[PDB]
Each structure stands twice: as structure tokens, then as C-alpha cells.
Design an enzyme around this catalytic site. Sequence first.
Site, PDB file in Angstrom:
ATOM      1  N   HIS A 194       0.891  -1.203   0.065  1.00 15.43           N
ATOM      2  CA  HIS A 194      -0.034   0.182   0.325  1.00 15.43           C
ATOM      3  C   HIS A 194       1.265   1.194  -0.446  1.00 15.43           C
ATOM      4  CE1 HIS A 194      -3.585  -2.727   1.803  1.00 15.43           C
ATOM      5  NE2 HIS A 194      -3.896  -2.425   0.888  1.00 15.43           N
ATOM      6  N   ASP A 221     -12.060 -10.933  -8.004  1.00 12.76           N
ATOM      7  CA  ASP A 221     -11.125 -11.819  -7.241  1.00 12.76           C
ATOM      8  C   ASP A 221     -12.413 -12.640  -6.672  1.00 12.76           C
ATOM      9  OD1 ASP A 221      -8.450 -10.295  -6.934  1.00 12.76           O
ATOM     10  OD2 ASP A 221      -9.071  -8.783  -5.461  1.00 12.76           O
TER      11      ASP A 221
HETATM   12  C1  LIG Z   1      -4.688  -5.088  -1.540  1.00 18.16           C
HETATM   13  C2  LIG Z   1      -4.759  -5.478  -2.645  1.00 18.16           C
HETATM   14  C3  LIG Z   1      -5.527  -7.234  -2.908  1.00 18.16           C
HETATM   15  C4  LIG Z   1      -6.188  -7.419  -1.825  1.00 18.16           C
HETATM   16  C5  LIG Z   1      -7.002  -7.995  -1.554  1.00 18.16           C
HETATM   17  C6  LIG Z   1      -7.803  -8.887  -0.719  1.00 18.16           C
HETATM   18  C7  LIG Z   1      -6.817  -9.432   0.463  1.00 18.16           C
HETATM   19  O1  LIG Z   1      -7.017  -9.625   1.416  1.00 18.16           O
HETATM   20  C8  LIG Z   1      -7.748 -11.857   1.377  1.00 18.16           C
HETATM   21  C9  LIG Z   1      -6.740 -12.342   1.437  1.00 18.16           C
HETATM   22  C10 LIG Z   1      -7.884 -13.559   2.087  1.00 18.16           C
HETATM   23  C11 LIG Z   1      -8.654 -13.890   1.502  1.00 18.16           C
HETATM   24  C12 LIG Z   1      -9.835 -12.887   0.865  1.00 18.16           C
HETATM   25  C13 LIG Z   1      -8.570 -11.172   0.430  1.00 18.16           C
HETATM   26  C14 LIG Z   1      -5.097  -9.176   0.306  1.00 18.16           C
HETATM   27  C15 LIG Z   1      -5.010  -8.599  -1.361  1.00 18.16           C
HETATM   28  C16 LIG Z   1      -5.980  -7.674  -4.350  1.00 18.16           C
HETATM   29  O2  LIG Z   1      -6.808  -8.779  -4.659  1.00 18.16           O
HETATM   30  C17 LIG Z   1      -5.242  -6.899  -5.825  1.00 18.16           C
HETATM   31  C18 LIG Z   1      -5.592  -6.633  -6.940  1.00 18.16           C
HETATM   32  C19 LIG Z   1      -4.994  -6.259  -8.777  1.00 18.16           C
HETATM   33  C20 LIG Z   1      -5.066  -4.587  -7.382  1.00 18.16           C
HETATM   34  C21 LIG Z   1      -4.061  -4.407  -6.302  1.00 18.16           C
HETATM   35  C22 LIG Z   1      -4.876  -5.516  -5.279  1.00 18.16           C
HETATM   36  N1  LIG Z   1      -4.196  -4.784  -3.749  1.00 18.16           N
END
Ligand SMILES: CC1=C(c2ccc(Oc3ccccc3)cc2)C(=O)C2CCCCC2=N1
Lengths: 372, 59, 22, 99, 89, 72, 48
Positions: A194, A221
Site C-alpha cells: 500500500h 477476485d
Molecule cells: C490489496 C490488494 C488486493 C488484496 C485484496 C484482499 C486481500 O485479502 C484477502 C485475503 C484472503 C482472502 C480474501 C482477501 C489481500 C489483497 C488485491 O487482490 C489486488 C488485486 C489487483 C489490484 C491491487 C490489489 N491490492
Amino acid sequence: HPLMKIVNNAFIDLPAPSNISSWWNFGSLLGICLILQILTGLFLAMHYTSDTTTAFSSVTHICRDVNYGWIIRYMHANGASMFFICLYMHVGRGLYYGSYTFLETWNIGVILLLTVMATAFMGYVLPWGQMSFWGATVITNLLSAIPYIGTNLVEWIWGGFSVDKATLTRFFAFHFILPFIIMAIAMVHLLFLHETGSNNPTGISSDVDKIPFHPYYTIKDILGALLLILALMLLVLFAPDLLGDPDNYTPANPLNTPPHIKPEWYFLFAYAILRSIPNKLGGVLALAFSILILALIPLLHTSKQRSMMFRPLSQCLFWALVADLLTLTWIGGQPVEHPYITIGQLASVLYFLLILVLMPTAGTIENKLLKW
Amino acid sequence: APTLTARLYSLLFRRTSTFALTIVVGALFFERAFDQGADAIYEHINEGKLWKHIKHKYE
Amino acid sequence: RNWVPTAQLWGAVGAVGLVSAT
Amino acid sequence: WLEGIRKWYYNAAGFNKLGLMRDDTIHENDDVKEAIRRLPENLYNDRVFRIKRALDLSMRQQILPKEQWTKYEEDKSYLEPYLKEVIRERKEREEWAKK
Amino acid sequence: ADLTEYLSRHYKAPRMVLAAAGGLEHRQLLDLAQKHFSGLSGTYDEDAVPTLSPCRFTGSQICHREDGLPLAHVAIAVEGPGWAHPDNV
Amino acid sequence: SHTDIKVPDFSDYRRPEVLDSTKSSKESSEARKGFSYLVTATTTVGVAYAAKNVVSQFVSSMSASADVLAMS
Amino acid sequence: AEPEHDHRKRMGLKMLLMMGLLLPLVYAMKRHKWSVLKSRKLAYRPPK
Ligand SMILES: CC1=C(c2ccc(Oc3ccccc3)cc2)C(=O)C2CCCCC2=N1
Ligand code: HEM
Ligand code: HEM
């Protein structure tokens, strides 16, 4: 409100780039794998026992007698593989698109890889089959190759003069906990991300064209999570013993070695690099450097372009490195006889040559072609 | 003329309150419908081989 | 006043739910 | 002599299909950021759009029509003269700091 | 040619209204309108009578990004009722 | 001028129910919403079916096993 | 060796059916949401 604001800046209105391909979906999947391994794993440990007398009986007790115990086991056992598939995608993405330029994020990554490797290795010992025992006995003993203290280091690790009940019980303790250290590390992996923002496929600053994570990348996602679940449940329900070795259904026996001795599929490339070198210490250092060279990748970077999208020579050598790894993965699976020794030898040299020598030179040439 | 899908929107899921009641009740029915169907499909796929087919035999 | 039909509908939504899994 | 294969590599690179010039794809760092900051309003606001459009293309997984592709002959090196000066000033500061 | 044709078409008696307000007698205004405005034509050439086709409202966005200007102006709206609809009140 | 700016043609991307530019969308709007929101609801139902089973299985493992029920 | 064998394949059928149902429905929601960006049209208009 202090928590929601963290979750906002994390997942709700984090400015993501507009043009992010499906190669960035693996990060969220790795968390889903980690949470899946944790939830399945917890429910396995509710019935599993870490004594050499009961360890095998307990795993079979789960499959046979614990209600829906089999489906939890194979979700853990194949999810472990799906975690690793996702990892090798997640690492390669960064190699291709130059995401290693977020040094700390990447270096925390390199740690995250190593911890999971240790987690999954110790996890594989737990059921106490032949390949689990003999996998540990082979892989651990490698440390005795260390110059002056390895022979002691190994006996300390084991808790005795071989792999035994002392080793199994601590390997369970280490398995059950290290996943939580991984999750803690993973939150710092995100914390540095971040700070630095996220990368896109062009390797060009996308501040000019950002979009909010929700609702775009949330639903994306989610879509990707179903494809991971599909891929898991295909393995669980139709092919649960595919990736796994049969010999681990034979209960462990230290007086009888199985002939084709090997790690699981996700270490075979590294196993092949170890077998390539005949000297024991050299084999261990090459085995180590095969993983740890990831930390030198951001220093080996040369091209004035960040991403490989606009770089033919680098793309070909990258796709060579993938094929070369798939060659080493194949060779590691096969026994140490002709012609596989020579193929493994060349593949192993090619691996380090692509990373250290060629791909930097490719980037340097690519610059000279564009008047850089 | 009120259409097919608009008639659902208008009265069944415009409000988020009823949206959920529709999903819940629809899911309640879907579970009965799907399980029953996919069970029967699997049982026709595997005719005579399961216990329920050869149970009358030894009972 | 206005949240009586909403809270009743959500009261129904929640109710069938407890029937949903159990 | 090899202006040929240079022109081949340009086309093989593919950033021209997105309507980007060479210096739009340069990896940002402290020098490039500074050179980009020194750019006058027109060249800055242009690269902004060229990049903003190229990302929008990259999202949709498409490229421009063949006539709109950037030309190896008409590929202006807008960023270089600034970036050369920024680098030369940094080198000077380092050479002065050496003593 | 365009201006005169636009005038000849649209500027006509049935499409027009003469309003007044103040200290004045309705009878007198009607005499003035009869004496001066009754020279306008009263229908068409049997065509050329344009009548309003309804306009499609489209939920959509337009974002003129311009950081140089000091303050952002935003205008958001949903489809309206039309002059006739009591709902307007 | 800024009056030179007309909005580009979305006739390529539009749905069939809003293509006629002489036609009020309001009659189609409820159908257009009802179609998309149906997809969402159908998805939520399909996940709800799955989620119930996944949870119930884990709950059942935590419950009393076969070998304990046998020798009770 | 595998007493779960029958039950597991029934779950298999039901999984394939349910994945067959959901994957397009979820993909449709993804496309429905991303549509806004995927159809958008960028116009550059500098001054003189
Ligand atoms: C912070 C972040 C996440 C993200 C979202 C949720 C997260 O946490 C989770 C962990 C486990 C299950 C669900 C969410 C971790 C990273 C992404 O996907 C992305 C995908 C592409 C844009 C940049 C980005 N940034
Ligand atoms: C990154 C996370 C994890 C990975 C990669 C992982 C990996 C593995 C692997 C590969 C096995 C051997 C599977 C087999 O062939 O039988 C295993 C077994 C096991 N794991 Fe994990 N595991 C993880 C997390 C957990 C957690 C968090 C727990 C408990 C909280 C757990 C408990 C177990 C138990 C009890 C076994 C033995 C039963 C069995 O063999 O299935 N695991 N693990
Ligand atoms: C448990 C394992 C891992 C988890 C949970 C994890 C989590 C994440 C997440 C959530 C993201 C953002 C989503 C994305 O862009 O893909 C991300 C990005 C990244 N991770 Fe990981 N990661 C893991 C392993 C690794 C490893 C092994 C490496 C390197 C060796 C690494 C390096 C990176 C890099 C460089 C990025 C930036 C992606 C970009 O270019 O935008 N990660 N990680």
C-alpha cells in the site's frame, strides 16, 4: 470507525490500476489457500495424534470414521498443492512484470515462500507413511553436509540420532503454528504494498488511470476464487491421489527404504539442482541458492523498461526459465540414471545462467536497440 | 404491458428487504430440487450397483 | 414508523435463515 | 547499418501499437521523476493522455488501428534532453561530494 | 437560408403566445394583437409541421478532468417527470 | 467551444431495449434491472446451497464419529 | 482403501453441475460491473 478505515484503505476504495490482468488474482488466492489450509488443518488436528504409535491410525481414523473427515483431509492435502501452484504463478508474475522493484514487498515475499516450504515439508511428515518418514530422513540429513556443525544441527533438529517420535511431535507443533507466522508476515507483505501502490502489466505509472478496488477487483477476485475452488474440488473429488505418492499409504518403516525416493512435486526442481552437483555441500548450497537467488533478482535488473511486455529477448528467456524449471521438475521426479543425470546437469546450469548471465544481458541489448 | 423479468423486479426484488427473502426461500427450494435431481441422475448413471438398488435382495 | 415493515421483513429473512442451515 | 533491426525491435517491442512513444515506457526512478517534473505543460499533459489511453487499451486487451501506431521515424525522444541534464547534475553533485 | 427557414417554420401563430402583465385592459391587448399580430400565418403547407419526438434519457457519466481549475463542479440527476406530471409539486 | 463536445455513440454497446433514441427508457428500465439483479440473486442462491453444505460437513466432523457411535 | 468412493463421485457430479451454474453467473456479474470501464471512451481536448 478506526478499523473500517483500515479496511477501506485496504479493500474498499484502494486505488487499483485499471488494466490489471488475471495474473494479479493469485495474491488473494494465496490468502484463500492459507485460510483454507488453516480451517481444514484445524479440523484435522481435532482428531490427529502426533505419536508414532497412533499417527497413521489417526489419519485413517479421520478418513474412514470421522464424519466427512476424508473431504477435509484431501482439501488440506491437495490445497497444499494448490497453494504452491498459486505461489509459483505469484512469483513468476513479479519476475515477468518487474514487480520485484517493490524491494521490501518482494523480500517479504521471499520469506513467505521459505516459511510455506518449511510448513508443507513438516506437514508431509505428520501422517507417518514411508515417503513422509523417508522424505524427512533424506532431506534433513542434507544439513550434515555443512562444514563444522551440521552433524550436530541435524541431531538437535531431530531430537536424537535419526528421524523419530521426537521429530514427528515437534514437526506437528511447528506445522500448527508457522501458518500464523505466515499470516502475520503476509500482513506486512500487504503493508509495504500500500505504501508503494500496485503494479500493472505495462510497467508504467498508472496514477493517471486508477479505479476503486470495490466493486471492480472484489467481484474479479471472487470469480477467481471459484476457479481455485473448482481446481481444488476437481482434485479432491475426482483425483485426490493424483499428485500424492502411493508409498505414503504404506506405514513408515525405518528398516526398509522405498526404491524411488523423492520429495513432493513442488520441491522437485530444487531436488534436481541438488542432484546435479555431486559434492554434498555444493548440492546443499545450490539447493539453497536456487530459492534465495530470488533476492538477487532486483539487483540483476538492467532494462530501462520495467515490465517485460515491451521486451522480446527477455520474454523468450523468461519463458525459457519456466520450461527449464518444468524440465528440472520432471528430472527431479525421475531416478538418478542416464540420461537424466546429464539432462539434470544442463538444466541446472541453464537455470542459474538464465537468471545471472543471460536475462541481464538481454535487458542491456534491448536498451542498446532502443538507443538507451 | 408489464413484462416477464420486470414483474419480478417490481414486486419481488426492488427492496433489499424482500431480495433476501426471495434468495432464502429460493435457496430452500433449490436445495430440495437440485439434490433430488442430481441424486436421481447419479443413481440412474449408476443403476443396480448401489446398496439401495440391491437392498430388497437381502432384507 | 417506517422501519417497522423493513424490520419485520428482515425479521422474516433472519427467521427462515435459522431454518436455512438448521 | 543495423537501423533495420533497430526498427524491427521497435515494432517487435509493441508499445507503438498502444500509441506510446519510447520515453512513455521508461521506468520511473528519482532521475526520471525529476525529468518528468521539469517537462513543460504540453509534453507532460500529452504523455499523461498517451499513457492514460495505453492503460485503457491494456485493460481491454486491445491495440490501436494500424495507422494510429507510433512510427519509428516519428518517435520523438521528448524526455531525454531533460533526463540527461538531471543525470549530469547528479553526477556533478556526486563528483563534488567525492572531494 | 437556414435562419430564414428556421424562422418561417417555427415562428408562427398557433405555436406562439402573447403575454402581458401590469395596468392594462385585456380588451385593448386583444385589439392590438388583432391589429398587428393577425398578419401571421395560421397553419402549415401540409407538412413541415415538426412535433416533438420524445428524448431517450440515458444513465451515464461525463468526466472532464481538469486539475488547473480551482474547484470541482458536479451535477448529478435522474430522469425527470415532464411539465405535465402532478408529481412535480 | 465546449458545445463542440457531443457524447460518442454507444449504439454498439447498448442493450436492445434502449437502442431507439426516440423512445423513453422507463418502460424497459424495470426489465433491465430485473434481468441483472436476477443473475445476482441466482448466484447468491447457488452459493448459499454450497455454503450450507460446506459448513454442515465441518460441523459433522466435530460431531460424534462412527466408531464412537458403534461402541456406544 | 476408499470407502468414500461412491459418495465422493456424487459430490463430484453436484460440484460440476453447481460450478457449471455459478461460473457464468459470477462471470456475468463481473462483466456487468466492469462494463462501465470496458465501453468507456477517452477524449483529449487541450487548449491553444
Ligand atoms: C490489496 C490488494 C488486493 C488484496 C485484496 C484482499 C486481500 O485479502 C484477502 C485475503 C484472503 C482472502 C480474501 C482477501 C489481500 C489483497 C488485491 O487482490 C489486488 C488485486 C489487483 C489490484 C491491487 C490489489 N491490492
Ligand atoms: C500453509 C499452510 C499449510 C500447508 C501448506 C499444509 C500442508 C500440509 C501437508 C502437505 C500435509 C500432508 C497431507 C497428506 O498427504 O496427508 C499436511 C498435513 C496436516 N496438516 Fe497441514 N498445512 C498447512 C496448515 C495447517 C494448519 C494451520 C494445521 C492446523 C491448525 C494443519 C494440520 C495438519 C494436520 C493435522 C495434518 C495431518 C493430517 C493429514 O495428513 O492430512 N495444517 N499439511
Ligand atoms: C503466502 C503467500 C503470499 C501471499 C498471501 C501474498 C499476498 C500478496 C497480495 C495479496 C498481493 C497483492 C495482489 C497481487 O498483486 O497479486 C501481493 C503482491 C505481491 N507479492 Fe505477494 N503474497 C505471497 C507470496 C509472495 C511471494 C513468494 C513473493 C516473492 C517471492 C511475493 C511478492 C509479491 C509482489 C512483488 C507483489 C506485487 C504485485 C504487483 O506487481 O502488483 N509474494 N502479494
